[PDB]
Design a protein around this ligand. Structure first.
Ligand SMILES: Nc1ncnc2c1ncn2[C@@H]1O[C@H](COP(=O)(O)OP(=O)(O)OP(=O)(O)OP(=O)(O)O)[C@@H](O)[C@H]1O
Ligand SMILES: Nc1ncnc2c1ncn2[C@@H]1O[C@H](COP(=O)(O)OP(=O)(O)OP(=O)(O)OP(=O)(O)O)[C@@H](O)[C@H]1O
Lengths: 394, 394
């Protein structure tokens, strides 16, 4: 039984998973943290954090390579899937990695320079170590390329779009794609005749409108910065306000960029934590700024869910997914109550059930729109694209 | 029969109106354009553009003062209403202008420096020329102060709000207030038990959610830049995208600020006109970029209308107002069709009727939500606040 090797190269780390081709089961998982720094270490299943100090993207990938031999599954690796940050306008679906693709990934790289170079470092590393192994590129953006111009164009002058490529792209595509597919089965809906709203809520948070199997509107923009307020990200922010802060504090464009990325969001308002689970406890203990941060977070989600419903002809399902979506009973209820206008009644027996209950409906019967939780599995989706492309001949 | 003098001092001009106290009828209207420049001129009813070259805010206001004597109504002026751009956090309602207010208007001025100084120039000018005449300040923001923190807080660090005042304020309040009040009569709704969405669409465009008589959510942010795409304004724009353009073209924060204000929006996408009526004709003549600009404009409105509905417990009415709202048959229909999810059926007989038909329902009977057009009258609303405050003793 062959296996798939999934790779997600961030700027700071390398996340991986080894899934069985036969069943799509997780056989192994690990992280290679502190990349390009003075100290780099690898942790698999939380066995023993082995530290090969000062190691690059290739060295750490070679470290996982040793560990695949150790656990005697190295020669069973039939496919390698790469998560790519930004596919630009060029990628509509997942592709088998060839020289062409590598050039095309480098071509769109300027749009997400930090994250994409890491992906390219990982593709080369995996190519080097695994030679006759078919490799697949899977893009966070591809699912959102079905959007019409009215949905992806900015109010900015046409020039910026045509010559520089400034448009809405959207992220969490793989998750949005996976969850949406799964919702067709659980809700027993006809894909080609449906309208779903998906709320991927974790550290990064985005909404997506899925009309008849296609993505028609999405929360995030050119960068992951637009839309919902997140763990450390501000989300929807008035540009006037942003430029006003610049003049008032004498901060540079780069300064503000760091603030909206790493200092804002839930962390920003509460001034306590970026982690939602911590902020839930602080509210319980009478922390107002944590309570505000959640109420606001809830509010911007409800606003964007309702907002995204406009791009549907009919609203059949609202689906929660991600770290917060799948696990936070509070946030799910608060968001839904904020959407009472859409004629939703919640089943609090079903909303109380923990994530172990997996794919679950949480709406009551008098509800005009079905609510459900569907655990996202991006590794499984990257595997399936790879398997399909594994049967292809290129 | 006494009269009210309404004044709106922009950076470039002074708009005025003389309304009869007895009936709220327009007796006179005019503009003082090209302010502080080498050439300043006054036009009343389009009679004869008289030009007093190189004149300040006081000189032009003194020119209108002469014309009020000429038409023998100078001594009938019982009240003077001033439109203020930014009331900050200090003003919840309209106030009788006193020294205190002047200080308080100067205090919040930094938030909208260009527009507010003009208002203050106008208040002093009117005070100078009209001494024993009661004067009222009316704020574009005041109506939106009912918003809860969850609705007005940004994802930015708490510090920016508490020490600098960076929050959502919202604009077109007077219009939103007037139109909403009027909708209670036309739709025969109980104010204290209602949920309305108001779409003020002109050169500046903003949405407002009115729950039980109060404003609970609004499109624009700290500055008029946030929210809907407008004539020359971009609207909702990803900050990542904005900072990316800065690095790519080497433009300053001020450069980009000019672009999103005066070069973007409908003007931006079409690359033809900021005027909607012109762009409607271009589409008819097969202009794609004008057609896109409209389709996008329609899209962001439908998105924000649906989005704002979340802050209501029930959706009773969607009301169109402003230059575009009251007059464009196309945009009204396109927006409503984009909101089919909300269960709206349109009466196209009623939607075809021109603005002469005034306050009019445009929705069909099977429609779950009532649609209507209500012409905004900001001068009438400024008059009514002034009349009420005229009966007060301060
Ligand atoms: N039991 C729980 N109750 C409440 N909140 C919980 C509970 N368990 C986790 N969280 C919150 O979920 C957030 C992390 O979500 P994630 O999906 O694991 O974040 P990720 O970073 O791994 O995935 P993303 O999908 O965000 O990746 P990117 O967007 O960054 O690419 C925590 O805030 C936690 O409080
Ligand atoms: N008959 C018409 N059909 C289609 N469009 C029309 C028709 N008549 C006018 N417009 C469009 O309306 C816009 C101007 O609206 P406005 O309300 O007069 O603009 P304003 O500047 O006077 O008022 P605002 O409410 O925008 O003020 P601020 O926000 O700037 O404070 C034009 O685009 C025209 O095409």
């Amino acid at each position: 039984f062959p296996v798939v090797l999934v790779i997600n190269c961030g700027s700071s780390s390398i996340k991986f998973s080894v899934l069985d081709v036969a069943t799509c089961d997780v056989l192994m998982a690990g992280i290679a943290d502190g990349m390009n720094t003075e100290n780099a270490f690898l942790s698999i299943n939380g066995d023993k954090p082995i530290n090969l100090a000062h190691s690059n993207y290739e060295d750490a990938l070679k470290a996982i390579a040793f560990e695949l031999e150790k656990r005697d599954l190295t020669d069973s690796v039939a496919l390698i899937g790469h998560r790519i940050a930004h596919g630009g306008e060029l990628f509509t679906q997942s592709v088998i990695i060839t020289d062409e693709i590598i050039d095309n990934i480098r071509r769109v790289s300027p749009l997400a320079p930090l994250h994409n170079y890491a992906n390219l470092s990982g593709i080369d590393a995996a190519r080097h170590l695994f030679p006759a192994v078919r490799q697949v590129a899977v893009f966070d953006t591809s699912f959102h390329q079905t959007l019409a111009p009215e949905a992806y164009l900015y109010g900015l002058p046409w020039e910026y779009f045509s010559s520089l490529g400034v448009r809405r792209y959207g992220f969490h595509g793989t998750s949005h794609r996976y969850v949406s597919r799964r919702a067709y089965e659980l809700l027993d809906l006809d894909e080609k005749d449906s309208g779903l709203i998906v709320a991927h809520l974790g550290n990064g948070a985005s909404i997506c409108a899925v009309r008849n199997g296609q993505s028609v509107d999405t929360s995030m923009g050119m960068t992951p910065l637009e839309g919902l307020m997140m763990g450390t990200r501000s989300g929807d922010v008035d540009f006037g306000a942003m430029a006003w802060i610049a003049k008032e504090t004498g901060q540079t464009l780069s300064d503000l960029e760091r603030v909206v990325n790493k200092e804002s969001g839930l962390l920003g308002i509460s001034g306590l934590s970026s982690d939602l689970r911590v902020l839930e406890k602080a509210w319980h203990e009478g922390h107002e700024r944590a309570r505000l941060a959640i109420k606001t977070f809830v509010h911007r989600i409800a606003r964007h869910i309702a907002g995204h419903a406009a791009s549907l002809h009919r609203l059949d399902g609202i689906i929660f997914t991600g770290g917060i979506g799948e696990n936070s009973v509070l946030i799910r209820q608060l968001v839904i109550e904020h959407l009472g206008v859409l004629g939703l009644t919640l089943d609090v027996e079903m909303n109380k059930q923990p994530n172990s209950h997996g794919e679950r409906i949480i709406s009551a019967n008098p509800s005009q729109v079905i609510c459900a939780v569907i655990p996202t599995n991006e590794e499984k989706m990257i595997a399936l694209d790879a398997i399909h492309l594994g049967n292809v001949k290129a």
